[PDB]
From TrEMBL, chain A:
It comes from the Bacteria. The chain holds residues 13 to 108 of 694 of the full protein. This is Uncharacterized protein. It comes from Azospirillum sp. TSO35-2.
């Protein structure tokens, strides 16, 4: 789905991305960042990718994947991801 | 936090991982290995799940290191043990990004 594409396209570290997931999950019963990280540790693709992937899937399950994708693109542009590569995820 | 990252990354058995936890907890009020083992075993008892107890033990130990301020020392010790078991260096850099 688009959750996997988004998770595979991003270049941000989870250390940064976790703030956007935490922001856009507001109002939903999706897992917190502590819960996502703990579930990935307890049920043990590179680890950081797994966390991003689990976050994006959770956003899709709880209906805020579009909001998260907007925030990720914003963070990417803040870290100078070229527009030609933002074009890849806009489709 | 980085406790969850470390616990997810390590493949060491608790039988081995308990040594680095016990060595790096010196000087702190962190729980001993038997205290962690009894606590986690009871928690796994009161909430039965498919989660391997060893994975809960390791996560608890990493969280305890973070609480008492020796998580960085525990990460170094864990990586040394993993390197002794020939954990591929490409995987070591994944955890070294902390």
């Amino acid at each position: 789905s688009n959750a996997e594409r988004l998770a595979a396209w991003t270049r941000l570290p989870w250390e940064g991305l976790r703030y956007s997931y935490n922001r856009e999950r507001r109002g939903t019963a999706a897992r917190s960042c502590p819960q996502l990280e703990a579930d990935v540790a307890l049920k043990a693709i590179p680890l950081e990718r797994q966390l991003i992937l689990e976050a994006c899937r959770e956003a899709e399950r709880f209906g805020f994947l579009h909001e998260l994708s907007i925030a990720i693109v914003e963070m990417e542009r803040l870290n100078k991801r070229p527009e030609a590569e933002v074009e890849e995820i806009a489709k």
